[PDB]
């Protein structure tokens, strides 16, 4: 929505004025947002998975998968096939609407207000922020949440350097500290 049009207006010519390409087909983009919510206590009860999928479906207009074990760990009490986590992806406006949600609503309503932790680099710009809380989002009922978990979110762009990922997400909000 908005940030498409910022790429139209200012971001992508600023990226040309910095990185000095030979085409706009040489330009980095943003593609995927991968979301993870495991339980582990589903050894006991998958009703945490139930209300977790309820929360995720109230976050974005999807329902996730139900990811199984793919291992066998007696220390975690795991066989094969034991369902653990849940996967949400984003495309379209649900990229950009969620981006502006992170700009506007959620992230300036997180206790111990400092900004955004920087070092999520992976070398090639793959910023994964393991979120502390569940009760941040305005779509969240206090009278349903029973644990103090948070969010695993993988954000994948085509930014080729950590500098590119920094400059893009700084031009998409994200107050690095």
């Amino acid at each position: 929505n908005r940030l498409k049009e910022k790429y139209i207006k200012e971001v992508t010519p600023s990226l040309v004025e910095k990185f000095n390409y030979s085409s706009v087909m040489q330009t980095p983009k943003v593609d995927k947002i991968v979301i993870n919510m495991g339980v582990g206590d589903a050894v006991s009860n998958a009703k945490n998975l139930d209300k977790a999928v309820e929360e995720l479906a109230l976050i974005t207009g999807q329902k996730p998968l139900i990811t199984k074990a793919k291992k066998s760990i007696a220390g975690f009490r795991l066989r094969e096939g034991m369902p653990i986590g849940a996967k949400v992806t984003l495309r379209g406006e649900r990229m950009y609407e969620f981006l502006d949600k992170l700009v506007t609503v959620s992230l300036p309503r997180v206790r111990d207000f400092h900004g955004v932790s920087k070092k999520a680099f992976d070398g090639r710009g793959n910023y994964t922020l393991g979120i502390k809380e569940q009760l941040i989002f305005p779509e969240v009922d206090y009278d349903l949440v029973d644990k103090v978990r948070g969010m695993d979110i993988v954000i994948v762009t085509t930014a080729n350097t950590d500098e590119e990922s920094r400059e893009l997400l700084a031009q998409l909000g994200m107050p690095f500290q």
Partner: protein
């Protein structure tokens, strides 16, 4: 887009204490009040008044 599996959401107007950042979507719904052209023709009731300078990391 697979049928009969999606949750409910519309381009929900987002009110604010300052300037009305009224340009996004939201899952929860309500009373349809600001059916406006420059904004959504949908519910306004998600009225988060964090201005993004309510914790002014951008401003101070």
């Amino acid at each position: 887009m697979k049928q009969d599996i999606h949750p409910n959401y519309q381009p929900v107007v987002f009110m604010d204490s300052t300037t009305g950042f009224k340009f996004l979507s939201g899952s929860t719904k309500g009373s349809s009040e600001t059916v406006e052209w420059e904004d959504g023709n949908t519910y306004p009731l998600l009225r988060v008044e964090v201005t993004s300078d309510s914790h002014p990391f951008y401003t101070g």
